[PDB]
């Protein structure tokens, strides 16, 4: 009874950051050999569980999340980090117990002219609670006068596009991130 780990990592497409997919894994036998013993994983770094100790344990629930971020924002997917994505898009609890996987996907997710299908949230009233997401796209209120749904002075759109092209350097190249969690 192998786990669908093959489907999560080899999915045809990953959702945007502000609408990260979440899949429930239970009642299965998990094999982490193919994950750690693969050179395609640029970053396999995690907290509270050593990677070699993964296969000798039992869990009650496995949660897998996925999205696509830039190369320079990978350091922000970690507990106790402050930044644009952590404060506004995807926040982890300080006592996080799970392994984060990310790798380059320039050849897949980036197209000449701009892949404007990837977005991120930039404006919000307050920071996000851990493992909490909001897909609401209401116009942001930044000034005193109510916006009433018209863009203009202090009424910017809360979403912006990364716009991947294969011309940028490694810093801006698309990365696909998988964030496993255990409990």
């Amino acid at each position: 009874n192998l786990c669908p780990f093959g489907e999560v990592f080899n999915a045809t497409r990953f959702a945007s950051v502000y609408a990260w997919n979440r899949k429930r894994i239970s009642n299965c036998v998990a094999d982490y050999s193919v994950l750690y013993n693969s050179a395609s994983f640029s970053t396999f770094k995690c907290y509270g569980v050593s990677p070699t100790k993964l296969n000798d344990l039992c869990f009650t629930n496995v949660y897998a999340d996925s999205f696509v971020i830039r190369g320079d924002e990978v350091r922000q997917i970690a507990p106790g980090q402050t930044g644009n994505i952590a404060d506004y898009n995807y926040k982890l609890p300080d006592d996080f117990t799970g392994c984060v996987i990310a790798w380059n996907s320039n050849n897949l997710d980036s197209k000449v002219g701009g892949n404007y299908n990837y977005l991120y949230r930039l404006f919000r009233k307050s920071n996000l609670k851990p493992f909490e997401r909001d897909i609401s796209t209401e116009i942001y209120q930044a000034g005193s006068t109510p916006c009433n749904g018209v863009k203009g002075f202090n009424c910017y759109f809360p979403l912006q596009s990364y716009g991947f092209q294969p011309t940028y350097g490694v810093g801006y190249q698309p990365y696909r991130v998988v964030v496993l969690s255990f409990e």
């Epitope: 045809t12 959702a15 945007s16 609408a19 050849n107 897949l108 197209k111 000449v112 002219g113 701009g114 892949n115 404007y116 299908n117 977005l119 796209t137 759109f157 979403l159 596009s161 294969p166």
Partner: antibody, heavy 125, light 103 residues
């Protein structure tokens, strides 16, 4: 980036016709191409598709197995062989380009664009 | 996936805030576009990826909503903005268009 079309016209039922969609200033040979039609007084309905490398082609459902799409990267021309026509197919046909590139012609990963530029249409009867 | 707009005859005065919805069946995230076809002419590309603006169009046209709902909001109707508006998903590979919204 000016798309021009030709062909079609008056034809007997059950006949065969071949259309042309030419490129006049861009790199067509490595863009994809798509065909969209509309009936008089109706909406738009998807018809066909073709990759830039001419390896992957997808057709519609109501016309599956009866149309053939082909392209020539040398002369920057696109064709659609249609045969065994009915009275339903009488409509206006546009050839639609795609917004953005993709270097790797991978299966189930092409043709996710938004039809950046269209043509002027014809009068297929 | 099957597209479903539910205006069919919506018409307003010169200058308003109309909202054309576009109901769907599955979840496609942000893979939905918008078109604008004047009578007897080829359609012109409008908001694509449900959030971007094609170069050239004014800022009075907006695209919002996420998940299985998408709406196009016009800030102020003018004489130029009187035509049909279609939907188009490109998640799977049937390309299901819309039905039509005559302003």
């Amino acid at each position: 980036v000016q798309l021009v079309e030709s062909g079609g016209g008056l034809v007997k039922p059950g006949g065969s016709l071949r259309l042309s969609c030419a490129a006049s200033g861009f790199t067509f040979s490595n863009y994809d191409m798509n065909w969209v039609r509309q009936a008089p007084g109706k909406g738009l309905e998807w018809v066909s598709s073709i990759s830039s490398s001419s390896t992957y082609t997808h057709y519609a459902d109501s016309v599956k197995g009866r149309f053939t799409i082909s392209r020539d990267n040398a002369k920057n021309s696109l064709y659609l062989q249609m045969n065994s026509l009915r009275a339903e197919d009488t409509a206006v046909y546009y050839c639609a380009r795609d917004r953005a590139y993709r270097l790797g012609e991978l299966s189930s990963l092409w043709g996710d664009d938004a039809f950046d530029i269209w043509g002027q249409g014809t009068m297929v009867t | 996936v099957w597209m479903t707009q539910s205006p069919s005859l919506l018409s307003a005065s010169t200058g308003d805030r109309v909202t054309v919805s576009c109901r769907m069946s599955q979840d496609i995230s942000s893979y939905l576009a918008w078109y604008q076809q004047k009578p007897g002419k080829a359609p012109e590309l409008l908001i694509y990826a449900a959030f971007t603006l094609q170069s050239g169009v004014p800022s009075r046209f907006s695209g919002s909503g996420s998940g299985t709902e998408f709406t196009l909001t016009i800030s102020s109707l003018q004489s130029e903005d009187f035509a049909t508006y279609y939907c188009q998903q490109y998640y799977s590979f049937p390309h299901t268009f819309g039905q039509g919204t005559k302003l």
